[PDB]
Amino acid sequence: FDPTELPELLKLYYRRLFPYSQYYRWLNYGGVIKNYFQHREFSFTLKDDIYIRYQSFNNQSDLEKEMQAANPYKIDIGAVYSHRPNQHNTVKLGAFQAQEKELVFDIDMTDYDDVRRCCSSADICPKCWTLMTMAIRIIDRALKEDFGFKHRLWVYSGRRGVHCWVCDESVRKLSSAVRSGIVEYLSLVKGGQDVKKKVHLSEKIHPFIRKSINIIKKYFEEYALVNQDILENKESWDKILALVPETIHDELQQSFQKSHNSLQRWEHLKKVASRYQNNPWLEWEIMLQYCFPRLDINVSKGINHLLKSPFSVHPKTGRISVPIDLQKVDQFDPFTVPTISFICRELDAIRTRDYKKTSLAPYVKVFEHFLENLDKSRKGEL
Ligand SMILES: O=c1ccn([C@@H]2O[C@H](COP(=O)(O)OP(=O)(O)OP(=O)(O)O)[C@@H](O)[C@H]2O)c(=O)[nH]1
Ligand SMILES: [Mg+2]
Ligand SMILES: [Mg+2]
Ligand SMILES: [Zn+2]
């Protein structure tokens, strides 16, 4: 992919590929509440790194114009305000307020750099992507089952991770305090680089952790013991030994040297830690530290937070921020996600269903299934 064709590719994309219809269907929420789409903040990042927010629109047409006209590199979605963002200059200090917004989560592979061995920073590969699978599975389960949120849109961020948009009517009205509280409930891995052991479990395990461990259990062997090989050598297993009491280090160090692979060594860790319990949950704290999701509290705390819009274009990778099918989450592949050059290539190889002919279609379907279930809820149908 070439980032210089981008300003040219965007023009075509924003005119004949971006699904404005389903897009407006989303943000207007069946017209039930007036000025809802009209008070929504957007932000655009043009060429030269020009950044502008407080963008508002009257309707889907007004949106289509201003975007094709601006032709932005980045499109961020903000809150629904007390007034029109466009006229914020006209609003008195104290009356311009962010009032409603979807509950949002940002999950970055980069935050796993201390527990993955294949990549670092903004690099991802198939060996470490499993972390996102476990993140989605773990968190979506909590949002669905523990919190009863019914309309959840998971989106690939374009490069390093996934976003989740929780759009239930009752959810969009949550105070910043409750939003912050949801993050605390979902969060287990605490500490910065200064902190070696980032997970501590009580004698009594809250169901959320239990169910979270059990999802991780399902992936741990292939991800951690095979792909990551977290016990390959001494340089690596010392990191694991740092997470368990010193009184078992020597016994384990020897067992690790006499074993051949991580599967053997992990099983040794399991037996030794277990004995240690008898006279607390070392095995699980290690799995949680290596596989449990890391969440940026700041993204989800603030109601006025601007998050990268679905179907945006990643300026460097060229990938489309595409919706993720929750039923096919283990099958999701960030490396086969259509790039803008690819869906423009396909459109140049053939008026409202032009996108259905491109590789972008199945993802728009998912967004539609997301939209359909919203309508039914507003109506009453299950
Ligand atoms: O000043 C701001 C305000 C808000 N944001 C918003 O915070 C979100 C945090 O997200 P990230 O900055 O971690 O990047 P990303 O998820 O959009 O995509 P990746 O490259 O990581 O895969 C971003 O998506 C952006 O919308 C900022 O980045 N800067
Ligand atoms: Mg991100
Ligand atoms: Mg972040
Ligand atoms: Zn990797």
Short mmCIF file of C-alpha atoms and ligand atoms in Angstrom, two decimals:
data_model
loop_
_atom_site.label_atom_id
_atom_site.label_comp_id
_atom_site.label_asym_id
_atom_site.label_seq_id
_atom_site.Cartn_x
_atom_site.Cartn_y
_atom_site.Cartn_z
CA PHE A 1 0.00 0.00 0.00
CA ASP A 2 1.22 3.48 -0.94
CA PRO A 3 0.26 6.41 1.36
CA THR A 4 0.71 8.94 -1.50
CA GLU A 5 -2.30 7.72 -3.48
CA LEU A 6 -4.26 8.39 -0.30
CA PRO A 7 -5.63 11.90 -1.02
CA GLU A 8 -6.78 10.63 -4.40
CA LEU A 9 -8.15 7.35 -3.01
CA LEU A 10 -10.06 9.20 -0.27
CA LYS A 11 -11.97 11.30 -2.80
CA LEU A 12 -13.24 8.17 -4.56
CA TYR A 13 -13.88 6.36 -1.26
CA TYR A 14 -15.82 9.19 0.37
CA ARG A 15 -17.98 9.64 -2.73
CA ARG A 16 -18.78 6.10 -3.85
CA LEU A 17 -17.85 3.71 -1.01
CA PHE A 18 -18.43 5.23 2.47
CA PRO A 19 -21.83 3.84 3.63
CA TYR A 20 -23.45 7.17 4.64
CA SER A 21 -26.92 5.59 4.70
CA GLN A 22 -26.16 3.03 7.38
CA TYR A 23 -23.91 5.69 8.90
CA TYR A 24 -26.77 8.17 9.33
CA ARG A 25 -29.08 5.35 10.43
CA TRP A 26 -26.66 4.74 13.26
CA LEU A 27 -26.08 8.23 14.61
CA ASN A 28 -29.71 9.41 14.23
CA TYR A 29 -31.19 6.46 16.17
CA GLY A 30 -34.58 6.32 14.41
CA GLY A 31 -35.31 10.03 14.76
CA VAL A 32 -36.99 9.44 18.14
CA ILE A 33 -35.15 12.38 19.74
CA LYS A 34 -34.85 15.75 18.02
CA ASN A 35 -31.51 17.49 17.41
CA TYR A 36 -29.64 14.28 18.26
CA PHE A 37 -27.72 13.99 14.98
CA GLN A 38 -27.78 17.77 14.76
CA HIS A 39 -25.87 18.15 18.05
CA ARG A 40 -23.26 15.46 17.39
CA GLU A 41 -19.62 16.53 17.34
CA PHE A 42 -17.26 15.32 14.65
CA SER A 43 -13.59 16.12 14.04
CA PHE A 44 -11.57 16.05 10.83
CA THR A 45 -7.84 15.73 10.25
CA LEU A 46 -6.96 17.15 6.87
CA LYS A 47 -3.62 17.27 5.04
CA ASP A 48 -0.83 19.21 6.79
CA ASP A 49 -2.13 17.76 10.08
CA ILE A 50 -4.83 20.42 10.24
CA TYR A 51 -7.13 19.37 13.06
CA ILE A 52 -10.66 20.71 13.53
CA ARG A 53 -13.44 19.61 15.89
CA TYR A 54 -16.93 20.88 16.82
CA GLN A 55 -18.18 19.90 13.37
CA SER A 56 -21.95 19.48 13.24
CA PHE A 57 -24.42 18.69 10.45
CA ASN A 58 -28.12 19.15 9.68
CA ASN A 59 -28.69 15.78 7.98
CA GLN A 60 -27.20 12.94 5.92
CA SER A 61 -26.96 15.16 2.84
CA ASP A 62 -25.17 17.91 4.77
CA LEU A 63 -22.76 15.27 6.06
CA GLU A 64 -22.05 13.84 2.59
CA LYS A 65 -21.23 17.29 1.22
CA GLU A 66 -18.95 18.53 3.97
CA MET A 67 -16.95 15.28 4.05
CA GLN A 68 -16.38 15.02 0.28
CA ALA A 69 -15.52 18.73 0.40
CA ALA A 70 -13.16 18.44 3.36
CA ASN A 71 -11.88 15.02 2.29
CA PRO A 72 -10.48 14.20 5.73
CA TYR A 73 -7.67 11.76 6.56
CA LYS A 74 -9.25 11.03 9.95
CA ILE A 75 -12.88 11.17 11.14
CA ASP A 76 -13.46 11.17 14.93
CA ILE A 77 -16.90 10.97 16.59
CA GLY A 78 -17.57 13.01 19.72
CA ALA A 79 -20.49 13.63 22.07
CA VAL A 80 -24.06 14.82 21.56
CA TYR A 81 -24.03 18.34 23.02
CA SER A 82 -26.53 20.74 24.60
CA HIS A 83 -26.36 22.90 21.48
CA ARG A 84 -25.10 22.62 17.93
CA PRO A 85 -21.29 22.24 18.02
CA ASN A 86 -21.07 24.58 15.00
CA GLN A 87 -22.54 27.42 17.03
CA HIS A 88 -20.49 26.85 20.19
CA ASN A 89 -18.94 30.32 19.83
CA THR A 90 -22.45 31.70 20.30
CA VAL A 91 -23.07 29.71 23.49
CA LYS A 92 -22.30 31.25 26.88
CA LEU A 93 -19.52 29.78 28.99
CA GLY A 94 -21.15 27.15 31.21
CA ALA A 95 -23.96 26.11 28.88
CA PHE A 96 -21.97 24.25 26.22
CA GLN A 97 -22.06 20.72 27.56
CA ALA A 98 -21.42 17.19 26.29
CA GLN A 99 -24.58 15.35 27.34
CA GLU A 100 -24.72 11.92 25.73
CA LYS A 101 -22.34 9.54 23.96
CA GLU A 102 -21.92 5.82 23.34
CA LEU A 103 -19.80 4.01 25.92
CA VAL A 104 -16.47 3.42 24.19
CA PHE A 105 -13.47 1.18 24.65
CA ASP A 106 -10.06 1.40 23.01
CA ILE A 107 -7.72 -1.60 23.24
CA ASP A 108 -4.10 -1.23 22.02
CA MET A 109 -1.71 -4.08 21.25
CA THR A 110 1.12 -1.74 22.26
CA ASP A 111 -0.02 -1.98 25.89
CA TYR A 112 0.88 -5.69 25.80
CA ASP A 113 4.52 -5.09 24.93
CA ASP A 114 5.69 -6.47 28.28
CA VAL A 115 3.95 -9.84 27.75
CA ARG A 116 4.33 -10.45 24.02
CA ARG A 117 7.59 -11.54 22.44
CA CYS A 118 7.02 -11.27 18.70
CA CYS A 119 6.32 -7.55 18.24
CA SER A 120 6.58 -4.20 19.99
CA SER A 121 4.97 -0.78 19.68
CA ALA A 122 2.67 -0.58 16.62
CA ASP A 123 3.63 -3.91 15.06
CA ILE A 124 1.14 -6.77 15.05
CA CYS A 125 1.41 -10.36 13.80
CA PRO A 126 -0.82 -13.43 13.99
CA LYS A 127 1.16 -14.70 16.98
CA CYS A 128 0.08 -11.80 19.20
CA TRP A 129 -3.34 -10.96 17.68
CA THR A 130 -4.92 -13.73 19.78
CA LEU A 131 -4.72 -11.21 22.60
CA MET A 132 -7.38 -9.11 20.86
CA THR A 133 -9.56 -12.18 20.39
CA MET A 134 -9.39 -12.84 24.13
CA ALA A 135 -9.96 -9.14 24.81
CA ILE A 136 -13.12 -9.00 22.72
CA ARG A 137 -14.43 -12.30 24.08
CA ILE A 138 -13.71 -11.34 27.71
CA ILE A 139 -15.07 -7.79 27.61
CA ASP A 140 -18.03 -8.35 25.30
CA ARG A 141 -19.12 -11.17 27.60
CA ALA A 142 -19.09 -8.75 30.53
CA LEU A 143 -20.86 -6.00 28.63
CA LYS A 144 -23.52 -8.46 27.45
CA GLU A 145 -23.99 -10.74 30.43
CA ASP A 146 -22.91 -8.73 33.48
CA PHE A 147 -24.19 -5.31 32.31
CA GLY A 148 -26.97 -6.29 29.90
CA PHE A 149 -25.80 -3.94 27.15
CA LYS A 150 -27.49 -5.21 23.97
CA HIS A 151 -26.10 -3.08 21.15
CA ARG A 152 -22.36 -3.40 20.94
CA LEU A 153 -20.35 -2.59 17.84
CA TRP A 154 -16.81 -3.94 17.72
CA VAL A 155 -14.50 -2.30 15.21
CA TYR A 156 -10.95 -2.92 14.00
CA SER A 157 -8.96 0.27 14.66
CA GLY A 158 -6.97 -0.07 11.44
CA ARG A 159 -3.59 -1.13 12.79
CA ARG A 160 -3.03 -1.91 16.46
CA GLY A 161 -6.35 -2.94 17.99
CA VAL A 162 -10.11 -2.84 18.28
CA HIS A 163 -12.76 -0.40 19.53
CA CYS A 164 -16.13 -1.24 21.07
CA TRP A 165 -19.15 1.05 20.86
CA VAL A 166 -21.95 0.36 23.34
CA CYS A 167 -24.98 2.20 21.99
CA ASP A 168 -27.90 1.17 24.21
CA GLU A 169 -30.21 4.11 24.87
CA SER A 170 -29.81 3.80 28.62
CA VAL A 171 -26.03 3.50 28.13
CA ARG A 172 -25.52 6.71 26.18
CA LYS A 173 -26.84 8.68 29.19
CA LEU A 174 -24.35 7.27 31.71
CA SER A 175 -22.48 9.83 33.80
CA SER A 176 -18.71 10.00 33.61
CA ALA A 177 -18.61 8.47 37.08
CA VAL A 178 -20.52 5.35 36.10
CA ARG A 179 -18.43 5.11 32.95
CA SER A 180 -15.28 5.20 35.04
CA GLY A 181 -16.82 2.58 37.32
CA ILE A 182 -17.43 0.19 34.45
CA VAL A 183 -13.75 0.47 33.55
CA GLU A 184 -12.69 -0.36 37.14
CA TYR A 185 -14.91 -3.43 37.13
CA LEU A 186 -13.39 -4.66 33.87
CA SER A 187 -9.79 -3.92 34.87
CA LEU A 188 -7.29 -6.34 36.46
CA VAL A 189 -3.80 -5.49 35.18
CA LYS A 190 -2.50 -2.61 37.31
CA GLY A 191 0.89 -0.93 37.25
CA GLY A 192 3.35 0.70 34.89
CA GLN A 193 6.82 -0.45 33.84
CA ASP A 194 7.93 0.25 37.41
CA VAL A 195 5.71 -2.63 38.57
CA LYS A 196 6.74 -6.24 37.84
CA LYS A 197 3.74 -8.20 39.21
CA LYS A 198 0.68 -6.55 37.69
CA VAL A 199 -2.02 -9.02 38.87
CA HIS A 200 -2.98 -10.01 42.43
CA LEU A 201 -5.97 -12.27 43.18
CA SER A 202 -7.82 -12.52 46.49
CA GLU A 203 -8.63 -15.83 48.14
CA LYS A 204 -12.16 -15.30 46.82
CA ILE A 205 -12.56 -14.85 43.08
CA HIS A 206 -15.29 -12.57 41.74
CA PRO A 207 -17.31 -14.32 38.94
CA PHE A 208 -16.09 -11.82 36.34
CA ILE A 209 -12.54 -12.97 36.93
CA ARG A 210 -13.61 -16.62 37.02
CA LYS A 211 -15.40 -16.39 33.68
CA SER A 212 -12.52 -14.31 32.30
CA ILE A 213 -9.95 -16.92 33.30
CA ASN A 214 -12.06 -19.66 31.70
CA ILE A 215 -12.05 -17.85 28.35
CA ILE A 216 -8.29 -17.39 28.64
CA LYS A 217 -7.89 -21.05 29.58
CA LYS A 218 -9.40 -21.88 26.19
CA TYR A 219 -6.60 -20.03 24.32
CA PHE A 220 -3.66 -20.07 26.72
CA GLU A 221 -1.79 -23.18 25.51
CA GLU A 222 -1.61 -22.26 21.84
CA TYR A 223 -1.06 -18.55 22.41
CA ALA A 224 1.28 -18.48 25.38
CA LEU A 225 3.05 -21.84 25.42
CA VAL A 226 3.34 -22.41 21.65
CA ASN A 227 3.17 -19.12 19.71
CA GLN A 228 4.69 -16.86 22.34
CA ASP A 229 6.66 -19.60 24.06
CA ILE A 230 6.77 -17.62 27.30
CA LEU A 231 8.99 -20.28 28.92
CA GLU A 232 11.35 -20.86 26.01
CA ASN A 233 14.54 -19.91 27.84
CA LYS A 234 15.85 -18.41 31.07
CA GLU A 235 15.61 -14.84 29.78
CA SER A 236 11.90 -15.40 29.27
CA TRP A 237 10.93 -17.62 32.20
CA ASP A 238 12.68 -15.34 34.67
CA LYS A 239 9.94 -12.88 33.80
CA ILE A 240 7.42 -15.50 34.90
CA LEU A 241 9.43 -16.33 38.01
CA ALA A 242 9.25 -12.66 38.96
CA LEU A 243 5.47 -13.12 39.32
CA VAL A 244 5.70 -15.97 41.86
CA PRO A 245 7.14 -16.16 45.43
CA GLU A 246 10.93 -16.56 45.73
CA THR A 247 10.60 -19.68 47.84
CA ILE A 248 9.68 -21.68 44.68
CA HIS A 249 12.17 -20.14 42.24
CA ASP A 250 14.96 -22.69 42.64
CA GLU A 251 12.72 -25.75 42.37
CA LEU A 252 11.22 -24.29 39.20
CA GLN A 253 14.53 -23.09 37.74
CA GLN A 254 15.81 -26.67 37.77
CA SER A 255 12.60 -28.17 36.40
CA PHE A 256 12.75 -25.63 33.59
CA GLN A 257 16.31 -26.55 32.66
CA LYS A 258 15.53 -30.30 32.59
CA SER A 259 12.36 -29.82 30.47
CA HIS A 260 12.39 -29.35 26.69
CA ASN A 261 9.54 -26.97 25.82
CA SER A 262 7.15 -24.50 27.44
CA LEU A 263 4.35 -27.04 27.70
CA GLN A 264 6.47 -29.20 29.96
CA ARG A 265 7.62 -26.22 31.98
CA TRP A 266 4.19 -24.66 32.36
CA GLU A 267 2.89 -27.92 33.72
CA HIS A 268 5.75 -27.88 36.25
CA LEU A 269 4.84 -24.34 37.25
CA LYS A 270 1.28 -25.55 37.78
CA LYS A 271 2.26 -28.44 40.07
CA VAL A 272 4.75 -26.42 42.15
CA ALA A 273 2.48 -23.40 42.59
CA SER A 274 -0.36 -25.71 43.57
CA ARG A 275 1.71 -27.24 46.40
CA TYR A 276 2.48 -23.75 47.50
CA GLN A 277 -1.26 -23.11 47.97
CA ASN A 278 -1.57 -25.84 50.60
CA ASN A 279 0.47 -24.20 53.36
CA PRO A 280 -2.29 -18.20 46.54
CA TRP A 281 -3.46 -18.29 42.87
CA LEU A 282 -0.15 -18.05 41.11
CA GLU A 283 -1.21 -19.93 37.97
CA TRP A 284 -4.15 -17.63 37.27
CA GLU A 285 -2.36 -14.41 38.12
CA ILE A 286 0.23 -15.34 35.52
CA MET A 287 -2.39 -16.13 32.87
CA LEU A 288 -4.29 -12.93 33.61
CA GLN A 289 -1.06 -10.87 33.48
CA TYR A 290 -0.17 -12.37 30.08
CA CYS A 291 -3.61 -12.57 28.44
CA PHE A 292 -6.19 -10.36 30.23
CA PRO A 293 -7.21 -7.14 28.43
CA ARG A 294 -5.54 -3.76 29.10
CA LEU A 295 -7.89 -0.80 28.94
CA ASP A 296 -7.16 2.92 28.63
CA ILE A 297 -9.36 4.36 31.40
CA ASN A 298 -9.24 7.81 29.78
CA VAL A 299 -10.97 6.76 26.57
CA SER A 300 -13.99 5.39 28.44
CA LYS A 301 -14.20 7.82 31.36
CA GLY A 302 -14.99 11.07 29.56
CA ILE A 303 -18.32 11.68 27.84
CA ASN A 304 -16.65 14.24 25.57
CA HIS A 305 -14.07 11.81 24.23
CA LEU A 306 -13.60 11.74 20.46
CA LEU A 307 -13.02 8.21 19.08
CA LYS A 308 -12.02 7.14 15.57
CA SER A 309 -15.17 6.62 13.51
CA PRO A 310 -16.13 3.27 11.98
CA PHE A 311 -15.33 3.02 8.26
CA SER A 312 -12.53 5.59 8.66
CA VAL A 313 -9.33 5.09 6.68
CA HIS A 314 -6.04 4.43 8.46
CA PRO A 315 -3.49 6.95 7.04
CA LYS A 316 -0.55 4.51 7.15
CA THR A 317 -1.88 0.96 6.85
CA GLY A 318 -4.70 2.04 4.57
CA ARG A 319 -7.03 -0.44 6.29
CA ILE A 320 -10.71 0.36 6.81
CA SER A 321 -12.02 0.57 10.36
CA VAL A 322 -14.37 -2.34 9.70
CA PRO A 323 -16.99 -3.86 12.02
CA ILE A 324 -16.10 -7.21 13.61
CA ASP A 325 -18.56 -10.09 13.46
CA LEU A 326 -18.84 -11.33 17.05
CA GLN A 327 -19.90 -14.79 15.88
CA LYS A 328 -16.72 -15.08 13.79
CA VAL A 329 -14.34 -13.39 16.25
CA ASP A 330 -11.77 -16.24 16.32
CA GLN A 331 -11.80 -16.03 12.54
CA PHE A 332 -11.20 -12.26 12.32
CA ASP A 333 -7.99 -11.40 10.49
CA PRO A 334 -6.56 -7.89 10.63
CA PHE A 335 -4.25 -8.70 7.70
CA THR A 336 -7.03 -9.50 5.23
CA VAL A 337 -9.08 -6.46 6.21
CA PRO A 338 -9.73 -4.52 2.96
CA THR A 339 -7.52 -1.50 2.31
CA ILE A 340 -8.83 1.64 0.64
CA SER A 341 -6.68 0.95 -2.43
CA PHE A 342 -8.24 -2.50 -2.69
CA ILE A 343 -11.91 -1.49 -2.55
CA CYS A 344 -11.23 1.39 -4.95
CA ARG A 345 -9.39 -1.07 -7.20
CA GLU A 346 -12.49 -3.29 -7.22
CA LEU A 347 -14.85 -0.38 -7.90
CA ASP A 348 -12.64 0.60 -10.87
CA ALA A 349 -13.15 -2.89 -12.29
CA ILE A 350 -16.87 -2.65 -13.06
CA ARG A 351 -25.64 3.72 -7.81
CA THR A 352 -26.41 3.15 -4.12
CA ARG A 353 -25.27 -0.48 -3.93
CA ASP A 354 -21.84 0.09 -5.45
CA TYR A 355 -20.12 -0.90 -2.21
CA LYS A 356 -21.87 -4.29 -2.15
CA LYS A 357 -19.71 -5.20 -5.16
CA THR A 358 -16.49 -4.49 -3.26
CA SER A 359 -14.86 -6.53 -0.48
CA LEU A 360 -16.22 -3.94 1.95
CA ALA A 361 -19.71 -5.43 1.70
CA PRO A 362 -19.75 -8.20 4.35
CA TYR A 363 -18.61 -5.68 6.95
CA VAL A 364 -21.38 -3.27 6.04
CA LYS A 365 -23.73 -6.22 6.53
CA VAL A 366 -22.53 -6.57 10.09
CA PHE A 367 -23.05 -2.88 10.67
CA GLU A 368 -26.55 -3.34 9.26
CA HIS A 369 -27.28 -6.28 11.58
CA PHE A 370 -26.07 -3.96 14.34
CA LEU A 371 -28.49 -1.31 13.06
CA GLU A 372 -31.42 -3.71 12.64
CA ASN A 373 -31.31 -4.86 16.27
CA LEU A 374 -31.33 -1.21 17.36
CA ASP A 375 -34.54 -0.51 15.46
CA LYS A 376 -36.32 -3.53 16.95
CA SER A 377 -35.40 -2.38 20.45
CA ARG A 378 -36.75 1.14 19.84
CA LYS A 379 -39.99 -0.40 18.60
CA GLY A 380 -40.37 -3.16 21.18
CA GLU A 381 -39.81 -6.31 19.12
CA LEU A 382 -37.29 -8.71 20.70
O1 LIG B 1 -6.51 14.33 21.32
C1 LIG B 1 -7.01 13.26 21.07
C2 LIG B 1 -8.32 13.01 21.41
C3 LIG B 1 -8.88 11.81 21.12
N1 LIG B 1 -8.15 10.86 20.50
C4 LIG B 1 -8.81 9.59 20.24
O2 LIG B 1 -8.33 8.62 21.06
C5 LIG B 1 -8.37 7.36 20.48
C6 LIG B 1 -7.32 6.48 21.14
O3 LIG B 1 -6.87 5.53 20.21
P1 LIG B 1 -5.34 5.48 19.82
O4 LIG B 1 -4.71 6.83 19.96
O5 LIG B 1 -4.65 4.48 20.71
O6 LIG B 1 -5.23 4.99 18.29
P2 LIG B 1 -6.43 4.22 17.54
O7 LIG B 1 -7.11 3.31 18.53
O8 LIG B 1 -7.43 5.24 16.98
O9 LIG B 1 -5.84 3.37 16.34
P3 LIG B 1 -4.52 2.49 16.41
O10 LIG B 1 -3.50 3.13 15.52
O11 LIG B 1 -4.05 2.44 17.85
O12 LIG B 1 -4.78 1.07 15.92
C7 LIG B 1 -8.09 7.65 19.04
O13 LIG B 1 -8.73 6.73 18.21
C8 LIG B 1 -8.67 9.04 18.84
O14 LIG B 1 -9.95 8.93 18.23
C9 LIG B 1 -6.83 11.11 20.16
O15 LIG B 1 -6.15 10.26 19.61
N2 LIG B 1 -6.28 12.31 20.45
MG MG B 2 -6.01 1.96 19.17
MG MG B 3 -5.57 4.78 23.99
ZN ZN B 4 3.26 -10.13 17.21
#
